[PDB]
Amino acid sequence: RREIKIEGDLVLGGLFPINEKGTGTEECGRINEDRGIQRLEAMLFAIDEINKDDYLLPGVKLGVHILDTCSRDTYALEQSLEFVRASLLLIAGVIGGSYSSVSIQVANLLRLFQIPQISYASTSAKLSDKSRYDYFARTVPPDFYQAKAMAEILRFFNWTYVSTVASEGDYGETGIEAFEQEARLRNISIATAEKVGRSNIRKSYDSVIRELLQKPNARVVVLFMRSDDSRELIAAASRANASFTWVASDGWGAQESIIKGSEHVAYGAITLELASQPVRQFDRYFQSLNPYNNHRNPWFRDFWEQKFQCSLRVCDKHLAIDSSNYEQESKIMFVVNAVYAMAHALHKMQRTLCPNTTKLCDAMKILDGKKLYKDYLLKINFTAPDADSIVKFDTFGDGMGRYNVFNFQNVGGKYSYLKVGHWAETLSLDVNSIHWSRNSVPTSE
C-alpha cells in the first residue's frame, strides 16, 4: 500500500502519475520519471518551502497525503477513496491529477465532500464546466486556446489539407473537436480524422497509419494525444516507413521519452507545451535527492533503478541526478503554483476567521470547503521560488492561454526540442530557426 503520509495541521491530498498504465491486464507499469516522480517531488518541495515561509501560513503546518494514479482514471478513483474515508485523516484540498480523465474521475468524487481540487496539468475544456466540476480549479488553461494556437500554426504555413489523430478520452477528443472548428474557421480542410486508444472501440495503430497514408496530400498530421499513445503511433509510423510532419499538443510537448529510439520518424515535429519558466530552487532540491537521503518517497528506489538501469548491473553509490541526465519537466511551475494557490487560499481564510492568531482557531477547525473554494481559492499572488507572473484563476477556475512552440531537431549530433515560437492571443514564430527534414548524408553507390 504505497503512499506518502506527512502529518500537519492541514493536510493536502496529492495525485501524480508515478507509474505508467500497465500492459494487457496489470494496473501499473514502468515509473514515469519526469511527469510522475519530478512532479511528486515538486509538490514535496513546495510544501517544505511553505512550511519555512514566515508570510504564508506561519503557525499552520501543511501536511500531505500523496498517492499514485498509475496514469489510469479507474486506479485514481480507488486511491481517491482514501481522501474521503475520513468523511465516510481529514483532507483540506487536493493537488492533481495530470491526465484529464483522472482529474475528471477524482472531481466527480471530491465534489461530494466539498473538497477543492487544483490540477497542475489537466487541460480538457470539459473541466471548465462549473455546473459539473464546482470544486475544481487549475493553474493551467483549457484546450480551447491550444486548439486555436495549432490552427493558427497551420494557417501561417498554409497547411490547408491535414489529417488528425486523437487519443480517446477527455483530453484528445474535445481537444481535436475544438481544433476542427478553429481549422474550419481558417479554411483548413481535414483529410481524415482518426482516434487511438486501449478500448474495444478503437482501430489498430497500424490501421490508423494506413488511413494517414491513403491521403498522401496530407503530409501534416495534427495530434491531440496522450504521451503513451504518441509512442505507439510513432512505432506504427516507423513499421510502415511513413513520413509525416507531426503538429502535436502538450500531451507530446517537449518530451524526449516519446522520441527516444525513434528520432528519425519524428524529425521536424512541431510541438506545443504550456508557457512556463523553470523553478531554479527546484533544480537544486531535485538534484540533491538520492536513494540514501530520500526516505519519505517510497517510489524513489524504483525510479532510481529504472533511471540508471541498475539494481541497488549494480547501482554505483555515487550515481547523481544532474544537468547531464536531467532537465526540469516543463509543467513543474504549475505544480508549485497549484500547491501555493491552495496555501494562499488557506492563509486568507485563516486571516479572515482567526485574525488574532497564526494558528488554526476553533472557528476554522471544521473547514467549509464550499467557502474555501468560492470565497478564497479564486485569489491573486506573484509566483513563488516579465510583468504577468501572477497566479490567479478566471471566473471558470482556469489559467491563461499561453503556449511555447517547439521543433524537434538535431543541433550538432544531439537530438532536442528547440523553442521556435509562442502563442498568447496571437502567434509569434522564428521561422528561420525551424528544421523540417533530417539532414542525411546523400548516398551515391
Next chain:
Amino acid sequence: RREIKIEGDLVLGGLFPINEKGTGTEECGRINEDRGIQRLEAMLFAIDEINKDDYLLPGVKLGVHILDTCSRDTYALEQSLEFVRASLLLIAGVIGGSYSSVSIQVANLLRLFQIPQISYASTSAKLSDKSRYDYFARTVPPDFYQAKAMAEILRFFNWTYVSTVASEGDYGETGIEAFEQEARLRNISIATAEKVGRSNIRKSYDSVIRELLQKPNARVVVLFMRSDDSRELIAAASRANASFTWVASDGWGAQESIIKGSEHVAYGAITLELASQPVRQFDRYFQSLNPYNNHRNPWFRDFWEQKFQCSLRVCDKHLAIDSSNYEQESKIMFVVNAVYAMAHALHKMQRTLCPNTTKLCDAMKILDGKKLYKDYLLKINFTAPDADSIVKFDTFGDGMGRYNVFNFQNVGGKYSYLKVGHWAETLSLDVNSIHWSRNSVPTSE
C-alpha cells in the same frame, strides 16, 4: 586599345580576365568583377606597396603593363605580343594569367624571349612540365593534389558510384583525368564521364544533364569546370529539374556569381578552393576606390556601371565598395604573393649584380631572363601585407597542395559558402556543420 602602362625602372607585365568570353562571336563580354577587376587591383596595390618598401627594391621603381585576356587564350596571345614587341617597352616578368589555357598560350610565347612568368591562379598539372614551360612558375599548386582531395572527400562519405563533368581544355580534362585515377585507387566507380565547352566537339549542356539522369544511382556529380561553364550546367540542371550533390573544383570555388539566381539547384554543394588568408590592407585599398579617384584603371568605369546596375538608372555619386557588397576574392593572396615573388627575385639579382648601389647598375641593364628564372625566382620569403606562411616554389616551380572545403548553405535567410573542412596531405572535415538539402517548409494542400 585598353591597357595600364605605368612607367618604372623595371616593368612587370600583367594578365587578368577583366572581361568574360563574349557570346557567339564577340571577343569580350561582361566585366568579371571579383576574378577580373579585384585581381587586377591586387596587382596595382602590391606594386604600390613594393614602391614604398625600403627593404625590397629601394632605388628600383616597379612599373606595370597590364592587359585584359577577355577569359580567352586566343585573345591573351594577341595581348601578349605587346610584351614581346620590344624584342621584335621592355618586360622583366609577367604576372598571370588566371585560366590555365591562357597561361599555357602565354608561356608558349614568353619562353621564346626568356621572360619569366608567374601565375596566381592556373592550376593545370600540365604547367608543372619544365621541359615545355621552362620560364613558368606559380604561387598555386598543380591539380594533382585537388583531384586527390576530392577523391578523399568521396571516399570519406562512401560516395563510391559517381558521375563526372569537366570543362574542355587544359584545366578540366587533366583535372578530371587525375581525379579518375585517385578515385580508382579508392574503389570509387565512375557512372558517366561528360565534357562541356564552347567547341564543335562538345555535346549540349542539356545532353550532359540527360547523361547524368540516365544513371540515377550516381547522385554525387564531381566537377572540374570553369566558372562560365559551371553556370551553363546549373541552368541546364534547373530546366530538367535535376537534383544532384555537386562536388566542385576551384573553378567554381566559393563564388556567389555561379549560384546567384539558381541557389536552389546548387544547394548542399561541396566546393574546394585553394587555402588562402585575406590580405587586410587590400580590403582597405579596394574599398577606397571609386570612378572619381581611380584614374589609372580604364575598365573601372565599366566595372562600376555593371556592379551597381547604373549609368554614370543614374549612379549615385556616393555609391561605395564596402562589406555590404564586397568580399575579397579567394585568390588575392596568390596575386600579391606572385608580384612579391617577382620583386624578391629582382631584388636578389640586384644585390648580387649591383652590391654597391640600390640602383639598376650597368651589369643589370640587360636582364638575363634565364638566370633571373633559375638562379633567383626559385626563392623564399614570408608573405607580405600559423608557421607556413612562406612564399616559395618547389623544383617544378609550383605552390603547396593546400585546399579549403566549402558547403553552399542558407544560414538564416541568406545563402553562402561555409568553410567545413581542409586538405593538406590529409582530409579534415567538420561533418556536423554540413547542410545536404534545402530546408523547405512542407506542403499540405
